[PDB]
Amino acid sequence: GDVEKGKKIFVQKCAQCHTVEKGGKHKTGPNLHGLFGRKTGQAPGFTYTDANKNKGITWKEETLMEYLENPKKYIPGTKMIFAGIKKKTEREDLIAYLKKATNE
Numbered sequence: 001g002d003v004e005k006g007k008k009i010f011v012q013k014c015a016q017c018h019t020v021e022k023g024g025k026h027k028t029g030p031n032l033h034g035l036f037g038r039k040t041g042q043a044p045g046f047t048y049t050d051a052n053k054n055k056g057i058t059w060k061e062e063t064l065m066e067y068l069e070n071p072k073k074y075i076p077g078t079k080m081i082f083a084g085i086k087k088k089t090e091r092e093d094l095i096a097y098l099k100k101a102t103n104e
C-alpha cells in the first residue's frame with residue numbers, strides 16, 4: 001500500500017487520539033512509537049483493557065489488516081466506535097505508512 005495515501009488516511013482517521021512520533025503526547029489512544037513488533041497493550045501510559053491483554057498477539061501488518069476490519073472480532077469487547085476500515089486499500093496504504101512512521 002502507499003505510505004502517502006496512508007499518511008492522509010492517518011491524518012484523517014487515526015492522528016486525533018494517537019501519535020507515532022517521539023514527544024507526541026499520549027492522547028485518548030497511546031503513542032504507538034515502535035508499534036510493529038510489540039504486543040497488544042505495551043505502550044506505557046494508557047490503561048489497557050482485559051480483552052486487549054486476552055488477545056495478547058504481536059502486531060505486524062496482517063494483524064492490523066484484520067483488526068482495522070473488525071476490532072470486535074480481533075479483541076472481543078473493545079470501545080465501539082467506527083465500524084472498521086472497510087477499504088482493504090486504505091488499510092494496506094495506512095499500514096505501509098505506519099511501518100515508515102513508527103521507524104521514521
Ligand code: HEC
Pocket residue numbers: 010013014015016017018028029030031032035039040041042043046048049052059068078079085
Ligand atoms: C481515538 C478516538 C481512537 C481512534 C480514532 C483510533 N484509536 Fe487506536 N486505540 C484507541 C484506544 C483507546 C486504544 C486502547 C484500547 C481500548 O480499546 O481502550 C487503541 C489501541 C490501538 C492499538 C492497539 C495497541 C496499543 O498500542 O494500544 C492499535 C494497533 C491502534 N489503536 C491503531 C489505531 C490506528 C491505526 C488507528 C487509525 C485507523 C486508530 N488506532 C484510531 C483509540 C483510538
Ligand SMILES: [C-]#N
Pocket residue numbers: 029071
Ligand atoms: C484503535 N482502534
